Design a protein around this nucleic acid. Structure first.
Length: 391
RNA sequence: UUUUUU
């Protein structure tokens, strides 16, 4: 016995099902450390940063510089750059920089390079943000001529630079989303932690450009995604770098799916009686559809934004406009968030907003079956807590 | 299509 609604669902299931050809693909130069000297890791990090922040070097190369700023943290970096090589979609090279001598400039290499190339980066060292001051990345001038006597502070500086990056990985879109203040709040609470010094802040202009670079490059984000997957996978007892990554992770995830999760929070997870209504159901049915599509998606699910796949479009807030508006109007009254921006659509319905207001304005109504059948609640207590809400 | 706080 096929029922009409049931076959309605059977129709809405086939549609929601989620080798790819090979195109032209450009080489990405990538740098690889070898050495055990703290001085050498220090110059490697300053160098990869002065590359990353170039005013004149082409794109793939700044990409590679950033890959290196994100790779430099490790000790044994052979296997981590092999894990870089594991991703067959792009194409990366090794360039064993073999270390540099006491003079900062020479890139002394044995394999696969040339001394004319031998003049460009160093030429590119000269690459400088005319807008940026002191002509250096770190805002306190007399910092980079420092002595890393031990490996621990060199690590810690690497951590701070990379974490400045990992913070700026969120709000990843292309327009200049202003997340400087939230970046600053997280820098401040990482100062509450203390793993990052106040002494090593970058220039925020160059940082936002580093962000713009991050999102213009496809595979550096893919590397971020794999970084973050191996971060979420590892437990607590480990090395500090994964702990920074996984700690910042919960701020990276779940991005751009925001109205969808507002609906989850306010619209549904409160199960107010107006949720039950004449029609709002159909969009609820589709809500649990995208739920099933979220769970059986799963392993790349908290990361579609960064991932970039078109399927999020299936996470369109627009088909929910009725529900979506209600859940919002209510959050607008009940919660005091989102009031400082335009978080609204033109495909909205006005009445269900008005009703989210009216329904949220009278908190006498929140009665749940759950606590009722939990505490054997009286009518006396019901009308009592009502008088409380009459405040 | 994207636009909080943690």
């Amino acid at each position: 016995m096929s029922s009409v609604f049931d076959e309605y669902e059977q129709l809405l299931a086939a549609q929601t099902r989620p080798e790819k050809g090979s195109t032209l693909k450009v080489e990405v130069p990538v740098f690889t450390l070898n050495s055990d000297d703290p001085e050498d890791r220090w110059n490697f990090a300053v160098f990869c940063l002065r590359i990353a922040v170039s005013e004149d070097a082409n794109k793939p190369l700044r990409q590679g510089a950033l890959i290196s700023l994100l790779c430099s943290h490790s000790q044994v970096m052979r296997n981590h750059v092999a894990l870089a090589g594991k991703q067959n979609e792009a194409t990366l090279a090794v360039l064993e920089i073999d270390g540099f001598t006491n003079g900062v400039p020479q890139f002394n290499n044995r394999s696969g390079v040339s001394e004319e190339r031998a003049q460009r980066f160093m030429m590119i060292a000269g690459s400088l943000p005319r807008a940026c001051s002191n002509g250096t990345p770190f805002v306190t001038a007399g910092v980079e001529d420092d002595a890393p006597e031990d490996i621990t502070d060199t690590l810690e500086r690497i951590l701070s630079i990379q974490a400045q990056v990992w913070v700026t990985v969120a709000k990843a879109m292309t327009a200049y989303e202003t997340a400087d203040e939230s970046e600053t709040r997280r820098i401040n609470k990482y100062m509450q932690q203390g793993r990052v010094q106040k002494k090593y802040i970058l220039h925020p202009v160059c940082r936002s450009a580093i962000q713009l670079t991050i999102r213009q490059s496809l595979a550096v984000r893919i590397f971020l995604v794999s970084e973050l997957k191996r971060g979420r996978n590892t437990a607590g007892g480990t090395s500090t770098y994964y702990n920074l990554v996984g700690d910042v992770d919960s701020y990276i995830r779940n991005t751009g799916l925001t109205a969808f999760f507002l609906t989850l929070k306010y619209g549904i997870n409160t199960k107010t009686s107006a949720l039950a209504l004449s029609s709002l159901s159909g969009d609820i049915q589709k809500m649990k559809q995208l739920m099933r599509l979220y769970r059986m998606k799963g392993d790349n699910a908290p990361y579609m934004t960064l991932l970039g796949d078109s399927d999020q479009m299936s996470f369109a807030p627009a088909e929910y406009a009725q529900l979506y508006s209600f859940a919002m109007g209510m959050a607008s009254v009940l919660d005091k968030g989102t009031g400082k921006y335009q978080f609204a659509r033109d495909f909205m319905s006005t009445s269900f907003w008005r009703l989210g207001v009216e329904y949220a304005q009278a908190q006498g109504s929140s009665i749940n079956e759950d606590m009722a059948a939990e505490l054997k609640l009286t009518p006396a207590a019901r009308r009592g807590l009502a008088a409380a809400a009459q405040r």
